[PDB]
Amino acid sequence: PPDKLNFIIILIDDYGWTDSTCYGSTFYETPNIDRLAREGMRFTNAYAACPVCSPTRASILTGKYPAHLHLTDWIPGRKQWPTSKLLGAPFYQELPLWETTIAERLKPLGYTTAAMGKWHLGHEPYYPERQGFDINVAGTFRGHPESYFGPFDLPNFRGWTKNDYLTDRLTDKALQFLEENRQRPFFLYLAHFAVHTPLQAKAEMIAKYERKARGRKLQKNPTYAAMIESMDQGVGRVMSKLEDLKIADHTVIIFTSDNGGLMYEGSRREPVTSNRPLRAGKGHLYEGGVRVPLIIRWPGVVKPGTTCDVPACSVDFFPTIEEMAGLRHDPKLALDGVSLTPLLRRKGGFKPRALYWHYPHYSNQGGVPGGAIREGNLKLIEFYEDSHVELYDLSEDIGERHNLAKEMPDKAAELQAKLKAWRASVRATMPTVNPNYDPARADQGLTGADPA
Ligand SMILES: [Ca+2]
Ligand SMILES: [Ca+2]
């Protein structure tokens, strides 16, 4: 007969567009992720459907936009500033069980399914076992690890010692799943806790990067760089286990991020990484917070070493996988993604389209309520506090410094209206004018509030 495809999604947490060597970094050292890029297709215009953790994770699994899911902030969300211009919108504190995940869709084709690492889509019963997965390892309502060192006390991930590194032990448990299901068709959602705060790593590895951090100016944080090395080791271990088991040939790998790099977590004087050239990072609707790494190895279909400039989003993985597994798109599902198989096959037929964002919240990283649309090369951001819009040309201004909104006031009007129409198509919940808005004491004093 043929060879049913396996699927691994490797999802690094808060991993920036430029936090890998094959994406421009000179600090961070990511040799395995590089080998994956050389073995596959690297996407220059890949996006996360939301600039914070929970909703992007909900996007990936459902093929639906966060605004459409009504899960639009990280759970449970920034505390309300008592005096801001806006009251945050309410949202589901869980990925609802009535949403279909890619795991549920594969199950009936004989797939074994596991979610391992960061869940952050609600308390149990909204955990993975009740959402298409056979195995949960380390998933909870939590959006971060208490520590990167043992002992541990998480679901099916219980106990090591103060000398055991999380990223290392999580990887062993994922290898365990590969070893167990070596002969079966499987889907693995591998969501590292890396590289979310708190910054902790092996001392010897930190030392390496302090020696390199001298007069670096930009990407400067040794602990973080070490987190990335320990993460990159975990990725090689997966890649090379697939070799030892003689199934790399028919296993699809998708390597990406749930949002852009952290840089100025709420009133902290130091940034964690930098996304230059891109403006800002995690918690913002600027490209820093939404443009992410995306590498796809599909041995024998994706010509290795290729790249793709076409904009892709978290919503596209559901239908991509569905089609990779020989499934008819269910017309009752009403997803927001399209399949990337035409791009991966370097064939044509990939219809040109718009991407949408909707973040009716204040973020912990300086972000403010807004939405955005990207059509071809132009990108409009709408700021919900005062309805003002910014428009950038990302072919000429990837760093979003020159605002064209005054210069091209009709493309601005066109895109704002296209975005408003989408907001309606999905009944995006909007924020509200705060009755206790007091401009005097409305500054929340988060160091991320752009200037760039
Ligand atoms: Ca995240
Ligand atoms: Ca379900």
Author numbering: 6 to 457
In the authors' words:
Carrageenans are sulfated polysaccharides found in the cell wall of certain red algae and consist of a backbone of galactose (G) residues linked together by alternating α-1,3 and β-1,4 glycosidic bonds. Sulfatases, which remove sulfate esters, modify the functional properties of carrageenan as well as its susceptibility to various GH enzyme types. They are classified into 4 families based on sequence homology, structure and mechanism (SulfAtlas), where the S1 formyl-glycine dependent sulfatase family include most of known sulfatases. In our study, we characterized a κ-carrageenan sulfatase, AMOR_S1_16A, belonging to the sulfatase S1_16 subfamily, which selectively desulfates the nonreducing end galactoses of κ-carrageenan oligomers in an exomode.
Here, we describe the identification, production and functional – and structural characterization of a thermostable carrageenan sulfatase identified from a metagenomic data set collected from the Arctic Mid-Ocean Ridges (AMOR). Named AMOR_S1_16A, this enzyme exhibits an exoacting mechanism, removing the sulfate ester at position 4 of the nonreducing end of κ-carrageenan oligomers. AMOR_S1_16A represents the first identified and structurally solved κ-carrageenan sulfatase from the S1_16 subfamily. With only a limited number of available structures, it introduces an important novel functionality to the diverse and complex enzyme repertoire for carrageenan processing, while enhancing our understanding of the substrate specificity and characteristics of the S1_16 subfamily. S1 sulfatases are calcium-dependent and contain an essential calcium binding site (typically D-D-D-Q/N) conserved across all S1 sulfatases with known 3D structure. They require post-translational modification of a cysteine or serine to formyl-glycine, which is catalyzed by the formyl-glycine generating enzyme. Additionally, S1 sulfatases share a set of polar residues in the catalytic site crucial for sulfate hydrolysis.
